[PDB]
């Protein structure tokens, strides 16, 4: 269920980084740790935000209504 | 449900006043100042500056309960020296230090590239 | 944070940490029996009735139901129903006394017996507070 | 110039790494806290939902809406609504944003912070424009839509401080360290065989002279040299997070000086 | 656009008197969801 805007712990904006992260993983065929670092997600509080996120919205958008 | 409004952290209530000066009952030339809608940001900074004053005999602050913004400041001064004057100079000393910092950072910032 | 308490960061709670949705469905049907005697989904007024709850019935539309999007709290009547006593008798359903939220979805369907039956889903967002368990 | 001294090590639009010398720790920390909690910003404080056929709840969307960083450059030319003489809100105390999005394509339709439209009179003040640091220029994914899906809403962005809600922090992490060598003995290190071997050396150790073993403890020494790095969310430029931080603190001390006068 | 009841099945906007049972017009499903208010809900973005 959709990328949180901002890291809970520090407040760093993370909601603009999801699509770029998926691309870094798929298109550039990079590993999660270097993908996170390329996004400028240096601290572990910001890293858990994205790496740990589960995008259920995709599943939800599948329901026909 | 029983949560106070978050503005109650920094907004004075009708009846509430910023400073409330009470003469200390335990010692001569000592005073207790209740600061409403203020925390550790003002308390630590003021207490530290008062200790930098040689005519200040005692200076301590406490926030009796985390639920409430308020803090209490106790000042004891030299015979002849008024605690309110000690608090005054401490404040101006901070303001002059802060003024100096603003300019010094601004000067530095201008030299930068990026 | 002694004897099993914990200190949670308010700032991270403001950003959404451990925040959750809460849903509660309330159900009703028009009667169980009566060849001519049938309960009715409607907004009840006087009609001698007096057996009302109030808890304002004022959020109800003419069908006896609240539209999704209306804010409900206290004991606001969410489903309005009457029992025909031979004038009306109140059979309205109030929101759980202690609860509050927004009407989320209101389902109007029929039972296998041909009974007009309703389900009302209400939605609250619960933010982590002082006596919450983790 | 006189008291506290600054030395900028690194500087960008997003960060400032600087050394703060000839300062008291009470000042360095009070400054640190002010940048987190008390610098005024603009953020969405009210959402009116016309249409939501989205898969997400009204309040779930409204929550993230408040979390979008908005231009807060010219924030001191905007009033706090609570002080404003209007009934409710107006151009003197608020910015109004619009959000209309519909699932036109069969493919998924993404809704961004770039899709909010300023509808009020900004009166030439640099305020309310969503902050976009994105390469594709989208910034902040609010929502995603399917075919028949719609979202129609109106936002009232008001002035506020993180102390009231974290969405108002120009904030982001504040890296703060003093005495990288533990010469002050402010911390007693936890070890197994060797605290030096077991604790990683601070990058700040280059900027300071090591203690030297053949020396007795400096009991009289006090902390003055704070290695800081202020990260900005976007709403306000870094230089401003620090300058307004200084300005705010200065202001709240002045309100005490003025309070003493009043009584 | 006097929305009263939407079909749970086909998303068809419709409406009828309590003398016209349940069911959908051009779908036939007996599900049905009530239309969102036009009162408009206000939220603090907190
Ligand atoms: Zn973080
Ligand atoms: Zn106004
Ligand atoms: Zn249908």
What is each CA distance from C59 to C27, C67, C74, in whole angstroms?
17, 8, 13
Q: Which domain holds residue E5?
A: 1-46
Q: How many domains does chain B have?
A: 1
Please tell me whether D205 is known to bind a ligand: no
What the block records as the tokens of A31 is 């590993």
Rounded distance between C-alpha atoms, residue D65 and residue D22, angstroms? 42
Cα separation, D129 vs D117, in Å, equals 8
* Cβ-defined contact of C123 to D166 (cutoff 8 Å): no
Q: How far apart are CA D114 and CA D117, in angstroms?
A: 8
Q: How far apart are CA D251 and CA D249, in angstroms?
A: 5
3-state secondary structure of C32: coil
Q: Which residues pair with A56 in a beta bridge?
A: none
Distance from the B23 Cα atom to the nearest Cα atom in chain D, whole angstroms: 15
Whether C125 sits inside 8 A of D59 (CB atoms) is yes
Helix (H, G, I), strand (E, B) or coil at D63: helix
Give CA–CA dist B57/B66, Å, rounded. 28
The H or E element spanning position B46 is helix B40-51
Residue D179 CB coordination number (10 Å): 19
Give distance in angstroms: CA of E30 to centre of ligand 3.
Answer: 8
Resolution in A: 2.8
Q: How far is the centre of ligand 3, averaged over its atoms, from the C-alpha of A64 (Å)?
A: 13
Q: Which CATH class name applies to A1-65? A: mainly alpha
* DSSP label at residue D152: E
> Quick one: closest CA in D to B18, which residue?
D259
Answer whether D180's CB lies under 8 Å from D189's CB: no
Domains of chain D in start order, with CATH, are 1-40+167-263 (3.30.1360.10), 41-166 (2.170.120.12)
| Cβ pair C12, C99 in contact under 8 A | no
Chains touching D (3+ CB pairs < 8 Å): A, B, C, E
Q: Which of C4, C58, C62, C113 is labelled catalytic?
A: C4
Strand partners, D15: D231
Identify the CA nearest to D255 among candidates C22, B38, B24, B22: B38
CB C116 within 8 A of CB C110: yes
Distance from CA of A16 to the nearest CA of D (A): 4
CA atoms within 13 A on the CB side of D262: 11
Dihedral angle over CA of A17, A23, A29, A35, nearest 10: 0
Q: Is residue D249 helix, strand or coil?
A: helix
CA atoms C67, D60, C121, C50: torsion sign: negative
Tell me if D63 and C16 make a contact (CB, 8 A cut-off). Answer: yes
Q: What's chain E's length in residues?
A: 46
Give the containing element (helix H, strand E) for D117: strand D117-118
Distance D233 CA to ligand 1 centre (A): 11
Instruction: Tell me how close the Cα of C9 comes to any Cα of chain D, in angstroms.
Output: 11
CB D137 within 8 A of CB D114: yes
∠ CA C120-C123-C124, rounded to 5°: 145
Tokens linked to D129: 């424009």
Q: Does domain C20-127 have CATH number 2.40.50.150?
A: yes
> Which neighbouring-strand residues pair with D228?
D18, D176
d(CA E17, CA C41): 12
Domain boundaries, chain A: 1-65
Cβ-count burial of D63 within 10 angstroms (0-12 exposed, 13-18 middle, 19+ buried)? buried
A10 is in an annotated binding site: yes
CA distance D251 to D255: 6
Residues of chain C contacting residue A1, judged by C-beta atoms under 8 Å apart: none
Reference C115, options C30, C17, C57, C12; nearest CA is C30
User: Which element (helix H / strand E) includes D247?
Assistant: helix D238-262
Please enumerate in sequence order all residues whose Cβ is within 8 A of that of C123, keeping only pairs 6 or more positions apart, or say none.
Answer: C21, C22, C23, C101, C102, C103, C104, D57
Structural domain range at position B56: 1-114
Does B82 touch chain D if contact means CB atoms closer than 8 Å?
no
Asked whether D97 and D128 are in contact (CB, 8 A), the reply is yes
* Residue C113 CB burial class (10 angstroms; 0-12, 13-18, ≥19): exposed
List of chains touching B (3+ CB pairs within 8 A): D
| Rg of chain A in Å (alpha carbons) | 12
**Bridge partners, residue D17, by sequence:** D10, D229
| Strand partners for C83 | C89
Name the domain count of chain E: 1
The answer to whether residues D95 and D123 touch, using CB atoms and an 8 Å cutoff, is no
A7 known ligand binder: yes
**How many H helices and E strands in chain D?**
4, 10
b vs e for B26-62, b when ≥16 Cβ sit within 10 Å of the residue's Cβ?
Answer: eeebbbbbbbbbbbebbbbbbbbbbeebeebbebebe
Find, among C124, D155, D53, D56, the residue nearest to A3 by Cα: D56
What residues flank ion ligand 3 with Cβ within 5 A?
A: E 7, 9-10, 12, 24, 27, 29
Tell me, yes or no, if C76 is annotated catalytic: no
Write down the residue that tokens 């449900």 correspond to. Answer: B1
Could you give the angle at which helices B40-51 and B83-111 cross, rounded to 10 degrees?
110
With an 8 Å Cβ cutoff, are C68 and E32 in contact?
no
Burial class (CB in 10 A: 0-12, 13-18, 19+), D159: buried
Which has the closest alpha carbon to D161: D15, D32, D36, D14?
A: D36
The CATH number of the domain where B66 resides is what? 3.30.1360.10
**How much distance in Å is there from the Cα of B6 to the middle of ligand 2?**
21
CA of D95 to the centre of ligand 2 (A): 10
Element (H or E) spanning C21, and its range? strand C20-29
Scan residues 27-46 of E and list those with Cβ closer than 8 Å to C: 30-37, 39-41, 46
Q: What is the CATH number of the domain that holds E31?
A: 2.20.28.30
Both tokens of residue E28?
A: 């036939």
Method of structure determination = X-ray
């Amino acid at each position: 269920m959709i990328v949180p805007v901002r890291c809970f712990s520090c407040g760093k904006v993370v909601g603009d980084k999801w699509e770029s992260y998926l691309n870094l993983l798929q298109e550039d065929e990079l590993d999660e740790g270097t993908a996170l670092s390329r996004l400028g997600l240096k601290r572990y509080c910001c890293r858990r935000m994205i790496l740990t996120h589960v995008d259920l919205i995709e599943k939800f958008l599948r329901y026909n209504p | 449900m029983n949560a106070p409004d978050r503005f109650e952290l920094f907004l004075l209530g009708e009846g509430e006043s910023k400073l409330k000066i009470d003469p200390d009952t335990k010692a001569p030339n000592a005073v207790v100042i209740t600061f409403e809608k203020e925390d550790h940001t003002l308390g630590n900074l003021i207490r530290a500056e008062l200790l930098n004053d040689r005519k200040v005999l005692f200076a301590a602050y406490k926030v009796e309960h985390p639920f409430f913004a308020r803090f209490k400041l106790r000042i004891q001064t030299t015979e002849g020296y008024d605690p309110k004057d000690a608090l005054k100079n401490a404040c101006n000393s901070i303001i002059n230090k802060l003024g100096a910092l603003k300019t010094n950072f601004e000067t530095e910032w201008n030299l930068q590239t990026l | 944070n002694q004897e099993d308490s914990m200190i949670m960061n308010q700032s991270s709670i403001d950003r959404g940490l451990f925040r959750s949705l809460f849903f509660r469905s309330y159900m009703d049907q028009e009667k169980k029996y009566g060849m001519s005697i049938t309960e009715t989904f409607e907004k009840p007024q006087r009609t001698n009735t007096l057996r009302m709850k109030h808890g304002t019935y004022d959020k109800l539309d003419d069908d006896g139901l609240i539209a999704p999007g209306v804010r409900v709290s206290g004991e606001d009547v969410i489903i309005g129903k009457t029992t025909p006593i031979s004038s009306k008798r109140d059979a309205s359903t109030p929101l759980r006394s202690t609860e509050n939220g927004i009407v989320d979805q209101v389902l109007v369907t029929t039972n296998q017996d041909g009974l007009k039956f309703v389900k009302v889903r209400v939605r609250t967002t619960k933010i982590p507070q002082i006596g919450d368990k983790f | 110039e006189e008291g506290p001294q600054v030395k900028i090590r690194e500087a960008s639009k997003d960060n400032v790494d600087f050394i703060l010398s000839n300062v008291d720790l009470a000042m360095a920390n009070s400054l640190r806290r002010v940048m987190i909690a008390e610098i005024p910003t603009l953020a969405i404080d009210s959402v009116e939902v016309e249409t939501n056929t989205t898969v997400l709840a009204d309040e779930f969307i409204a929550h993230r809406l408040g979390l979008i960083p908005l231009q807060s450059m010219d924030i001191e030319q905007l009033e706090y609504s609570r002080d404003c003489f209007c009934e409710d809100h107006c151009d003197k105390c608020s910015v109004v944003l619009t959000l209309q999005a519909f699932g036109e394509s069969e493919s998924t339709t993404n809704v961004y912070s770039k899709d909010l439209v300023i509808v009020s009179n900004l009166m030439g003040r640099n305020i309310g424009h969503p902050i976009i640091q994105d390469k594709e220029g989208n910034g902040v994914l609010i929502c995603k839509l399917r075919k028949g899906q719609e979202l129609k809403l109106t936002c009232v962005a008001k002035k506020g401080i993180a102390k009231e809600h974290a969405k108002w922090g120009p904030a982001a992490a504040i890296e703060f360290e003093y005495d990288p060598w533990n010469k002050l003995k402010h911390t007693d290190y936890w070890y197994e065989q060797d605290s030096a071997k077991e604790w990683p050396q601070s990058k700040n150790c280059e900027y300071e002279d090591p203690p030297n073993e053949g020396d007795p403890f400096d009991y009289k020494a006090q902390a003055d040299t704070f290695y800081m790095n202020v990260e900005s969310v976007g709403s306000i430029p870094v230089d401003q997070v620090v300058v307004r931080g200084i300005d705010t603190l200065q202001k709240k001390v002045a309100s005490i000086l003025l309070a003493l006068t009043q009584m | 656009a006097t929305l009263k009841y939407i079909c749970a099945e086909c998303s068809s906007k419709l409406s009828l008197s309590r003398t016209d049972a349940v069911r959908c017009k051009d779908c036939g499903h007996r599900i049905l969801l009530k239309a969102r208010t036009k009162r408009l809900v206000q939220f603090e973005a907190r």
